Each structure stands twice: as structure tokens, then as C-alpha cells.
Ligand binder design. Structure first.
Ligand SMILES: [Ca+2]
Lengths: 56, 222
């Protein structure tokens, strides 16, 4: 389950704010994404995040 | 920029901030209407901010101009990061002391050349701390040999390493797309690295000298 994976910033040096599902907190939170090599627990909005991972 | 110093208000006039509701990448002004940055910084709704020093408060020397076009290199590879370059056309031309363009290189720079890297990225290797003002760093271009030893099978002919093997001085999250200026010419674009300021893990940059022809022609036909 990719929804249980910790957020992955990656090697690129951008500061792009994305969302990831935090199973512990039971909600989607923001994190800094570097711009490349995103894993699946990386969403552009909280709504996408909840729709895909909510309740995982 | 980790381990750098405060540049000084508008001392790096070609430095721009790419804003999408917040600063997410840097870029270099190479023409009154064109900006060069990294392909991974591609985003819709980009607003380019020029003449910036403190990115958090309006100080009066700013010019905010939205992008009318964003052209990522046709051969950019999101997996290998090869050809990590993009051109952004401004909706209107900037008014060029505080805002000026930087020259494209006539030729490639050699290992050992000292360059100025700048940006509003994270200033901590372990942690998070984004500055309000622009930070600067002087780092030397490293040999293709050591770069390839630091990142086995990851360095292409279009990339170069710069920095210090000891660590402590490097570009970091929020610096992507920014300039690496050597001898007054734009030689690189901040691109990637393993963490920030790590020992034996220098920053990797897009080698601008290999794209001068593509840039000039692309600018002229758009
Ligand atoms: Ca400002």
C-alpha cells in the first residue's frame, strides 16, 4: 500500500508543496517535493489525496 | 543555498524567482522577455518575479510578470534528469541596474573554474530554513571524473558537478533552476543532488554551454 509510504522529496532541488496521506494522523498533509522522481503518495491537492488514500 | 552568504540587495540582477503562490524555483534572465530555468520546475500558472531581494516583502524594485509560454527541452527525461532545461517567455518584456540579463557562454568552463551559485532555497543540510533574502555561494566546477565517481552511472554529458567533497556548501530545495555564473557567463542551472551539502555528494547542474544553439534559435522562433 503506497498510501502507507512516507513522503519522498527526491533528488531534485525545487520546493514544490504537495500532499501525502499520513496514515498515523489519518489525514493528508503537506510536504516539500523536489520536482522529480515522485512516488505514488504524492498529490497535487488534499482532495486528490483523500479520494485516493483516505481511510487507508 | 547551504553554507553561503547574503548576496546583497540586487547584486545578482539576473536572478529571478518562479512563483506559483509561493517561491518554488529560481531562474535566470537572459533576455528582456526570456528566462531560463530547469525542466523539472515546469508548472502551469507561473509568475516570474524580478528585482527581488526579500521574497516576502514588497520593497519597490520588483516587477511581477506572468509567463506566456513555457518550453521544456524536447528531450528532457524525467527519469534520468537528462536535458533538464526550460525556457519561459514573459507575457511582457521586463524593464532592464537591479534587473539585467546574463550572457550565454561562448564555450564550456573547465574543472576548477570558480562560479557563483545563488537562490532562496533551504539553508540547512539537516533541517529546514528558508531565507527571506537571496543567498550566494562560490563553488568550483569539478572534474567529470570525480562527478561520475560521486554518482555512478547517473552523470550524462549534459551535467556537471560543482561544490566541495567535504560537504557543507551546496544548493538545496528551492534553488532549482537558478544560475551558476562563471566569468560573467551562465554556465549552469541548479538541478539535483543526493540530499544537500553531504560529503562526497556535490550538487549536479545542467551544462548550459551544450544548449546555446537551441536556446538562441528557440528564443527567436517563439
Ligand atoms: Ca520583495
Amino acid at each position: 500500500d503506497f498510501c502507507l509510504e512516507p513522503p519522498y522529496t527526491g533528488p531534485c532541488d525545487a520546493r514544490i508543496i504537495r500532499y501525502f496521506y499520513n496514515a498515523k494522523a489519518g489525514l493528508c498533509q503537506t510536504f516539500v517535493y523536489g520536482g522529480c522522481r515522485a512516488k505514488r503518495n504524492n498529490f497535487k491537492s488534499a482532495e486528490d489525496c483523500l479520494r485516493t488514500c483516505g481511510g487507508a | 543555498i547551504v553554507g553561503g552568504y547574503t548576496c546583497g540587495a540586487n547584486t545578482v540582477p539576473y536572478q529571478v524567482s518562479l512563483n506559483s503562490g509561493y517561491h518554488f524555483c529560481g531562474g535566470s534572465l537572459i533576455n528582456s522577455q526570456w528566462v531560463v530555468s530547469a525542466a523539472h520546475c515546469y508548472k502551469s500558472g507561473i509568475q516570474v518575479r524580478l528585482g527581488e531581494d526579500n521574497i516576502n516583502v514588497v520593497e519597490g524594485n520588483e516587477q511581477f510578470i506572468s509567463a506566456s509560454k513555457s518550453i521544456v527541452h524536447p528531450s528532457y527525461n524525467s527519469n534520468t534528469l537528462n536535458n533538464d532545461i526550460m525556457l519561459i517567455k514573459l507575457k511582457s518584456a521586463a524593464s532592464l541596474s537591479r534587473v539585467a540579463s546574463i550572457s550565454l557562454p561562448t564555450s564550456c568552463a573547465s574543472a576548477g573554474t570558480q562560479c557563483l551559485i545563488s537562490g532562496w532555497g533551504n539553508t540547512k543540510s539537516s533541517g529546514t530554513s528558508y531565507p527571506d533574502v537571496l543567498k550566494c555561494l562560490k563553488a568550483p566546477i569539478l572534474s567529470d571524473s570525480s562527478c561520475k565517481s560521486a554518482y555512478p552511472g547517473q552523470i550524462t554529458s549534459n551535467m556537471f558537478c560543482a561544490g566541495y567533497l567535504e560537504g557543507g556548501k551546496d544548493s538545496c530545495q528551492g534553488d532549482s533552476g537558478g544560475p551558476v555564473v562563471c566569468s560573467g557567463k551562465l554556465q549552469g542551472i541548479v538541478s539535483w543532488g543526493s540530499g544537500c551539502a553531504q560529503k562526497n555528494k556535490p550538487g549536479v547542474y545542467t551544462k548550459v554551454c551544450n544548449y546555446v544553439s537551441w536556446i538562441k534559435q528557440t528564443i527567436a522562433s517563439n
